[PDB]
Design a protein around this ligand. Structure first.
Ligand SMILES: CCCCCCCCCCCCCCCCCCCC(=O)O[C@H](COC(=O)CCCCCCCCCCCCCC)COP(=O)(O)OCCN
Ligand SMILES: NC(=O)C1=CN([C@@H]2O[C@H](COP(=O)(O)OP(=O)(O)OC[C@H]3O[C@@H](n4cnc5c(N)ncnc54)[C@H](OP(=O)(O)O)[C@@H]3O)[C@@H](O)[C@H]2O)C=CC1
Ligand code: SF4
Ligand code: SF4
Ligand code: SF4
Lengths: 68, 395, 154, 199, 101, 347, 60, 134, 216
């Protein structure tokens, strides 16, 4: 049943683009841009473990970071 | 061995965007048209969805009254009236007669401005601009009455649980009565320019035809029902205030076209003038808000002289009253139709669920059936007769 | 030359400020107060402010209503279509700061997040005379500018 | 008037119905065939000479010569009642001591949550606010805060000319509100004296 | 403790007549459509104790109390002060939902 | 990914929040030239992360309108009257600022201001004023890649002299040296398009031999952020060239291709002829106000800078040191702006 | 006003004095159609009408 | 009610009234008494499919008998309209609308319930009743 | 049936005596006896139509909703020709969280009835659009706000919320402010959505008294 609901919602997501409910800039922002950004990303492999990096970053790891 | 017959295909999936000579607000309308004739209309709403229903859940009952004024900016009083009636039903609070009269009077006044705006903006959408400007001066005279009673011309928040916020200022009844002495002549002036005009007749006759069965099926109310031949009015069939005392006749038409509903709205303005005159002559004397101070704020001298009144003032302006657990749906005859609030209370000082029943939501749903076989130009007139308000449609 | 440039810039300021073509983005309650402000009783056309349906022919834009997340792209699109001077007036608490729907999932907290705003007109709804006061404040802002003198000494 | 001609209609299908069927003569609202020569001339000249149009023309032309209703906004101002809810203002006692006692009821009653208040004991010993700021971009000018205040400290003044060029100037604070109360003291006091009779 | 003998009677009766279908733990959270990092937050299920100022027993778990008294609360996150106006700023979406509703 | 702090002293105390618009970043910035093409994006990057940006501008309310939207309440401070010769105003502008970015430059000379004033005198004077304060921790100056003391063009020579003066007064300043920047409001592709379409003939200096390394504006804006997030970058000059080195002829051809121009409108205006056609017109410029008809392209300095190869030196710092991969300027989002004009299925 | 010197809310408390009773209905017992249609008019003369309520309840 | 037409028409004609209010949309047929009798008898024939000891069938039988009686004493078709508070046309459409839901009721058979079926009913008692008197 | 205007003068009556009685006190018993399988429980309470009268509330299961609605519309004695609205209420304390509420009008009876179907997140409610055409948008709104799926709906789509909205806002577990916020970026000349940050947080004021008793 949860699978049925998820499939219906995904069909809705497809229909928004197909029926022009959503616009070109929506497609740029939500799909194409992040995928291209990930390819263009260069990062230094951090020698510090995951705990050390988050400890240096913020006190509460659960809070999100913007423009990382 | 008998040949089959093929058919034709429809294209031109137009997008009719926010457009100024239409019902006020932002309308996005996707229309599928075979040539110059519409085959499907799909109204896109949510452009003025401010999350009102969920915001109500986080506010106290008295803190949520201003939401109903802003749901419909044309008719504020009728919108807050249903909310206060539902809270009164759950609280078992009795309104004094003077406050009941004041509510009925101002409800009729807002009905009149709503009908003025509807008719003259519809004429503007057709393309006649003189009735429109001829009407703003009347609407200003009525906004002046609002600013007198409440201090706000549009969002008064004057109706309260158990009565009205303040009493009528001295001299108001005379001024309202003068506006009434001249209103009928002004309405006749407007009526001549619209009624009898060949171009107006051609634009509006036999456009937007609705039948009684169709109206009940789609849940329509008010002028749409009465323009088709249905003698149904909440003020008469299900009275909610001293409306039962009031003497007025339902306007009825039978064709269901745009013209019939325009005629109904004009006659409704006249009936509202009659109700106002009766209210003015029979206005009682006494309390305007309920004597109970566990649901209504005490007077200022009384809070400044009595300990119990200071306690009641403090606990009503900080916590608010507690509404007994229960559910109720109270509807009022708004100028656009039937506006109702389904209020669910679990016994606290905040509403658990406040569903708002939009009269214009069902009319916008009816748009597709009505605007079938019409033209791109007819859509504007059809929207005008529905008189939809999108802050009211999108809660 | 510095005198001539000043005479030219003051004439240009008179021309721009006197004839303001506003486009009204009428979402909600405040658009009707604007309707009243352009009615017979307040003559905005006497002030030279006459409303133009299309963005390309409008130099001042009035955001009057609650901006929603669904609409903000269309608001920005309309703003971008306008020509270069493009002054923007924010009218009402909803447009100024979200107002009474500020803590909502569907409401933008102020049109300033989406479009730059030159003048903020406060009210719910702002009184029509208050809207004319804001329009006169924008007119003063236009008068203050001395673009041609700055062009001479740039 | 309300009566309609067989030819005049806005819908193609209805025009077809009336063109090819005579059910319209059964209907009472429609206009029936003239049945006399003079009536035929009357209807023909009415349609061909645009009679109904001219009748509206004269009534509209009455507009040219009737008394114009308009207000020169800078020179003349629209009538404003005492109850009018405008720019907020904190008030002082005639001695010069602020009326505010930091009950914080106005912040609890604020429908829009536009008021933030924090207080302390003053050195003399009074309950006074160290902060009273109102967001005028979040205010809805309901006037509930003026209703909840037990000492008439907060009032909505009669001023509607308070537009600003930046949003930061619309975030009022205690000093600004007190200055606004000082500027409009006499008008606010007269309005309150008049309003006290009613409530 | 005896009986409320009011709308709560029909409320409880609607509860006992009807029931919900069993699903695997966490499956509904995907149907909800909220960010999945919301469920990474930890939950404390508690009943508030009585305030020491007042002697009423309504808020406590007492036979007198007929209202729901067990709250789901989420852990507290970072809060700061607006540089311009000193307002308390936050980035926690679930700050007040659990306490309030 | 883990957010990296702005490496400024005592940032750890002041900083708070996720790093967004409403968060608090401990950076107060005075960006000179904010209303310009380069400056606006730098202001956007700094203010986007919750920092406060002071933007001195020459009186022009309509030009500085986009900067108003950039930040939350009180974060973007616009100072109305900026003059390069006024010391007191400069001191007031950098009073609370711990980083100062200088993007003030002129492509052409006028009667009021010459290259030597804007590109030499202002950097030296501002450098002294910043040095005396001490609160300012980071200084970034934006210059061209081709700037050299031994350069024929007066613009690119004065820029290098001003950079050397800045290095003398503040030893810890970072000299950002991007190439021809491509953007929606750029002066590279927009001027090339206007040349191809609304000009009778498109003169190309020599045959387009000159090599260039164009870069996208977002890459330079991100590079500024990476400079500010590392203190080890101080005292170093970074040549922020683009991913691909292209001759000018390739860029002209590819613009003609993307716009789907009917044919090639470019002509060969070889050097030693532009040096005679534009040489009097420079003296014309120095005695007349700003005129839209002629500018930038129609100067001897432009011809002199289009006869050399404006490419990064081999041994040099660049985007790799800042851990940024520059995006190609001939494809993708960078080229959408020229793409909207015409692509042959368009109009 | 007779409430000035005579204060008694418990006598005038309608909010907290509402209650809900309980019944059980079964299909076995037949419905009484005599009640529904025995009182129904068979001729125009016997028609009886319910008048509109003039005012809503008030304490006075 | 009040007619919104400036034209003067007679509403006691009992046909001009029907033309004005648009009853013709509901049914193009005239809607005489005999048609009502036929419709009621056809409903009675239809409800025969429902089991004999079914409360729904008894209800339809009782209603049809009441309306056949009201047709009986009243020889005027307008008198039937006054007694039944309806136009004869919509009274006739009523029985057809009842006919429409018979298939849906014969598919689920709501009348089948066990001999221990019990539907709990909660009723509201107003405080005004108790406070004023007992 | 359809309240076509019949009486030109003296229609002062709210309705006839018999029609009022049958609906004032026999309506719930009549429904239960006539269609027992559909009904599970019934509540008579404060009237939707008025303060003085009493209107029924009927609780039914999702499987029987279509047949119960069809019976209510077309039964001769009970003609609920109109669907006023369709609504859901979220009760997180219950296993079956959602209570889908149907509000109907009988013009002939001058009465209002309320029908409730109690479901959970996974179960679906059959659409009643064939009975009342007005249901389509109301069920679409119920799907958008609360996430209740309606079976055999002609096209179940979101109405009020923004395009791409996946959460259901009126669920009691949904934050009042939501999860995302919308802003225009200068760098990317697009209006974009970002995680929420609040300059001033919503202040929940706990006004509850220990001594209160009305809270259930
Ligand atoms: C009867 C006498 C017997 C002798 C026979 C003589 C026949 C007439 C010869 C006289 C010549 C003068 C005629 C005047 C022009 C009218 C042309 C025909 C009139 C007409 O058909 O009416 C409408 C056309 O006018 C319109 O409505 C067009 C729109 C007008 C809008 C602008 C009006 C401008 C003001 C009027 C002019 C005044 C000039 C000075 C100010 C059509 O519409 P329909 O549908 O009703 O007819 C179709 C019904 N099958
Ligand atoms: N192609 C490019 O864009 C590249 C640019 N650069 C360098 O970056 C700098 C700026 O780039 P760009 O932004 O494109 O140039 P712009 O001319 O677009 O920005 C120039 C800024 O400096 C201001 N300015 C110019 N002269 C004066 C003055 N005399 N007094 C005060 N303010 C002044 C301008 O304000 P006003 O508008 O009032 O003049 C404007 O804000 C230049 O030095 C340029 O060489 C580096 C690499 C490539
Ligand atoms: S600010 Fe007030 S009046 Fe204006 S649109 Fe918003 S709610 Fe309506
Ligand atoms: S008028 Fe209303 S919204 Fe404004 S500060 Fe006072 S209580 Fe708050
Ligand atoms: S202004 Fe009035 S209500 Fe507000 S804190 Fe001061 S005394 Fe209390």
């Amino acid at each position: 049943r949860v699978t049925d609901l998820l499939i219906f919602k995904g069909r809705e997501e497809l229909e928004t683009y197909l029926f022009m409910y959503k616009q070109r800039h929506h497609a740029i922002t939500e799909y194409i841009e992040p995928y291209q950004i990930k390819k263009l990303l260069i990062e230094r492999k951090s020698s510090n473990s995951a705990f050390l990096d988050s400890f240096y970053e913020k006190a509460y790891p659960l809070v999100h970071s913007k423009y990382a | 061995m008998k040949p089959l017959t093929p058919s034709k295909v429809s294209n031109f999936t137009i997008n009719f965007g926010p457009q100024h000579p239409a019902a006020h607000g932002v309308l996005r309308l996707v229309l599928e048209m075979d040539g110059e004739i519409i085959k499907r209309a799909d109204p896109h709403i949510g452009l003025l969805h401010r999350g009102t229903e969920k915001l109500l859940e986080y506010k106290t009952y008295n803190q949520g009254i201003p939401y109903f004024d802003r749901l419909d900016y044309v008719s504020m009083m009728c919108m807050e009236h249903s909310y206060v009636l539902a809270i009164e039903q759950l609280l078992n609070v009795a309104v004094p007669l003077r406050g009941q009269y004041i509510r009925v009077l101002f409800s009729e006044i807002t009905r009149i401005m709503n009908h003025i705006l509807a008719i003259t903006c519809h004429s503007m959408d057709v393309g006649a601009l003189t009735p429109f400007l001829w009407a703003f001066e009347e609407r200003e005279k009525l906004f002046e009455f609002y600013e007198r009673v409440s201090g706000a011309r549009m969002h008064a928040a004057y109706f309260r649980v158990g009565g009205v916020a303040q009493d009528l200022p001295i001299g108001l009844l005379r001024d309202i009565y003068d506006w009434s002495r001249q209103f009928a002549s002004r309405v006749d002036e407007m009526e001549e320019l619209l009624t009898g005009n060949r171009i107006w007749k051609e634009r509006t006759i036999d456009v937007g035809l609705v039948t009684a069965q169709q109206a009940w099926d789609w849940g329509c109310s008010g002028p749409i029902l009465r323009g088709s031949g249905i003698d149904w009015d909440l003020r008469k069939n299900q009275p909610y205030d001293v409306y039962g005392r009031m003497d007025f006749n339902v306007p009825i038409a039978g064709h269901g076209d745009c013209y019939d509903r325009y005629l109904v709205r004009v006659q409704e303005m006249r009936e509202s003038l009659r109700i106002i005159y009766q209210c003015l002559n029979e206005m009682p004397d006494g309390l305007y808000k309920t004597p109970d101070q566990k649901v209504s704020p005490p007077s200022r001298g009384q809070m400044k002289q009595s300990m119990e009144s200071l306690i009641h003032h403090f606990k009503l302006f900080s916590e608010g009253y507690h509404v007994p657990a229960g559910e109720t749906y109270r509807a009022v005859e708004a100028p656009k139709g039937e506006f109702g609030v389904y209020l669910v209370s679990r016994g606290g000082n905040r509403p658990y669920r406040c569903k708002i029943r939009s009269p214009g939501y069902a009319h916008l749903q009816m748009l597709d059936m009505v605007a079938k076989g019409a033209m791109l130009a007819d859509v504007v007139t059809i929207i005008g007769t529905l008189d939809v308000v999108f802050g009211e449609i999108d809660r | 030359a510095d005198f001539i440039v000043s005479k030219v810039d003051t004439v240009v300021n008179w021309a721009r400020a006197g004839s303001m073509w506003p486009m009204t983005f009428g979402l909600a309650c405040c658009a009707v107060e604007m309707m009243h402000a352009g009615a017979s009783r307040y003559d905005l056309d006497r002030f030279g402010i006459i409303f133009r349906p299309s963005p390309r022919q409008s130099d001042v834009m009035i955001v009057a209503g609650t901006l929603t997340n669904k609409m903000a792209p269309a608001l920005r699109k309309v703003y971008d279509q306008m020509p270069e001077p493009k002054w923007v007036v924010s009218m009402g608490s909803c447009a100024n700061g979200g107002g009474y729907y500020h803590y909502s999932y569907s409401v933008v907290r102020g049109c300033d997040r989406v479009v730059p705003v030159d003048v903020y007109v406060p009210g719910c709804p702002p009184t029509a005379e208050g809207l004319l006061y804001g329009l006169l404040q924008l007119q003063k802002k236009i008068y203050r500018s001395k673009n041609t003198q700055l062009w001479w000494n740039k | 008037g309300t009566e309609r001609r067989p030819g005049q209609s806005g819908a193609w299908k209805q025009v077809d119905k009336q063109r090819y069927s005579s059910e319209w003569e059964q209907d009472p609202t429609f206009k029936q065939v003239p049945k006399n020569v003079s009536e035929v001339l009357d209807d023909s000249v009415s349609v061909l000479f645009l009679t109904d149009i001219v009748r509206g023309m004269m009534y509209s032309a009455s507009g040219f010569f009737d008394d114009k209703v308009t207000i020169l906004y800078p020179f003349e101002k629209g009538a404003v009642s005492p109850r009018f809810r405008g720019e907020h203002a904190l008030r002082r006692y005639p001695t010069g001591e602020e009326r505010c006692i930091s009950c914080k009821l106005c912040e609890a009653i604020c429908p829009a949550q536009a008021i933030t208040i924090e207080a302390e004991e003053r050195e003399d010993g009074s309950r006074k606010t160290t902060r009273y700021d109102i967001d005028m971009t979040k205010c809805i000018y309901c006037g509930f805060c003026q209703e909840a205040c037990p000492v008439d400290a907060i009032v909505e003044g009669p001023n509607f000319e308070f537009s600003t060029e930046t949003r930061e100037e619309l975030l009022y604070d205690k000093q600004k509100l007190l200055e606004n109360g000082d500027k409009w003291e006499q008008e606010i006091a007269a309005n309150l004296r008049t309003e006290s009779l009613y409530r | 403790a005896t009986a409320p003998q009011d709308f709560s009677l029909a409320m409880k009766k609607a509860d006992e007549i009807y029931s919900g279908k069993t699903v695997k733990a966490g499956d509904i959270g995907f149907s909800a459509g909220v960010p999945l990092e919301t469920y990474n937050r930890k939950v404390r299920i508690f009943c508030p104790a009585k305030a020491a100022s007042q002697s009423g027993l309504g808020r406590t778990l007492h036979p007198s109390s007929k209202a729901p008294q067990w709250k789901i609360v989420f852990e507290n996150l970072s809060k700061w002060e607006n540089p311009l106006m000193g307002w308390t700023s936050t980035a926690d979406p679930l700050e007040n939902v659990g306490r309030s509703t | 990914s883990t957010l990296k702090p702005f490496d400024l002293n005592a940032n750890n105390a002041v900083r708070n929040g996720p790093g967004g618009r409403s968060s608090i970043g401990g950076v107060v910035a005075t960006v000179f030239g904010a209303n310009g093409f380069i400056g606006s994006y730098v202001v956007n990057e700094i203010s986007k992360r919750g920092n406060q940006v002071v933007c001195p501008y020459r009186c022009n309310e309509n030009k500085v309108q986009p900067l108003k939207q950039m930040g939350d309440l009180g974060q973007v401070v616009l100072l109305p009257e900026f003059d390069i010769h006024d010391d007191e105003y400069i001191r007031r502008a950098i009073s609370r600022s711990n980083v100062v970015i200088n993007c003030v430059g002129i492509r052409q000379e006028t009667k009021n201001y010459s290259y030597k004033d804007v590109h030499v005198d202002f950097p030296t004077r501002l450098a002294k004023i910043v040095a005396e304060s001490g609160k300012v921790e980071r200084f970034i100056q934006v210059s061209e890649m081709g700037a050299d003391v031994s350069h024929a063009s007066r613009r690119l020579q004065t820029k290098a002299v001003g950079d050397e003066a800045i290095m003398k007064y503040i030893p810890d300043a970072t000299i950002i040296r991007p190439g021809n920047v491509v953007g929606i409001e750029d002066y590279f592709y927009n001027n090339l398009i206007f040349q191809l379409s609304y000009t009778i003939v498109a003169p190309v200096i020599n045959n387009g031999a000159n090599k260039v390394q164009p870069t996208y504006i977002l890459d330079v804006a991100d590079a500024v952020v990476k400079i500010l997030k590392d203190k080890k970058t101080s005292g170093k000059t970074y040549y922020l060239g683009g991913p691909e080195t292209l001759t000018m002829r390739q860029i002209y051809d590819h613009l003609i291709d993307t716009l789907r121009l009917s044919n090639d409108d470019t002509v060969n205006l070889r050097y030693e002829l532009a040096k005679m056609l534009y040489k009097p017109l420079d003296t014309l410029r120095t005695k007349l106000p700003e005129f839209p008809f002629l500018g930038f392209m129609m100067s001897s300095d432009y011809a002199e800078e289009q006869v050399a190869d404006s490419v990064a030196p081999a041994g040099s710092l660049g985007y790799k040191d800042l851990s940024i991969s520059p995006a190609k300027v001939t494809e993708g989002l960078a080229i959408e702006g020229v793409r909207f004009i015409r692509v042959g299925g368009y109009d | 006003p007779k409430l000035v010197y005579d204060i008694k809310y418990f006598a005038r408390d309608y909010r907290r004095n509402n209650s809900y009773t309980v019944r059980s209905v079964d299909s076995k017992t037949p419905f009484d159609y005599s009640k529904v249609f025995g009182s129904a008019p068979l001729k125009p003369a016997d028609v009886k009408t319910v008048r509109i309520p003039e005012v809503m309840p008030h304490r006075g | 009610f009040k007619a919104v037409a400036d034209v003067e028409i007679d509403f006691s004609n009992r046909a001009v009234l029907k033309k004005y209010v648009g009853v013709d949309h509901l049914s193009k047929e005239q809607g005489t008494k005999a048609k009502f009798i036929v419709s009621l008898n056809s409903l009675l024939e239809a409800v025969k499919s429902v089991p004999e000891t079914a409360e729904y069938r008894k209800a339809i039988e009782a209603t049809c008998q009441y309306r056949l009686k009201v047709c009986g004493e009243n020889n005027s078709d307008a008198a039937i309209e006054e007694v039944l508070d309806a136009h004869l046309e919509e009274l006739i459409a009523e029985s057809k609308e009842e006919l429409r839901i018979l298939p849906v009721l014969l598919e689920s058979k709501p009348w089948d319930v066990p001999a221990d079926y019990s539907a709990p009913v909660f009723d509201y008692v107003d405080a005004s009743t108790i406070l004023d008197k007992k | 049936s359809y309240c076509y205007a019949r009486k030109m003068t003296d229609k002062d009556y709210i309705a006839y005596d018999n029609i009022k009685n049958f609906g004032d006190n026999y309506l719930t018993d009549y429904i239960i006896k006539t269609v027992p399988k559909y009904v599970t429980m019934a509540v008579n309470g404060p009237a939707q139509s008025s303060v003085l009268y009493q209107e029924p509330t009927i609780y039914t299961t999702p499987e029987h909703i279509y047949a119960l609605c069809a019976f209510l519309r077309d039964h001769v004695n009970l003609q609920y020709k109109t669907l006023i609205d369709i609504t859901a209420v979220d009760y997180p304390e219950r296993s079956a969280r959602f209570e889908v509420v149907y509000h109907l009008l009988s013009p002939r009876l001058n009465n209002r009835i309320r029908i409730k179907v109690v479901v959970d997140e996974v179960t679906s409610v059959p659409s009643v659009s064939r009975i009342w055409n007005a249901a389509n948008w109301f069920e679409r709104e119920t799907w958008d706000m609360f996430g209740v799926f309606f079976s055999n709906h002609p096209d179940l789509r979101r109405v009020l919320t923004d395009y791409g909205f996946t959460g259901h806002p009126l669920r009691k577990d949904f934050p009042l402010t939501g999860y995302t916020e919308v802003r225009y970026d200068y760098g990317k000349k697009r209006v974009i959505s970002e995680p929420l940050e609040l300059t001033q947080e919503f202040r929940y004021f706990d006004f509850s008294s220990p001594w209160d008793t009305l809270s259930r």
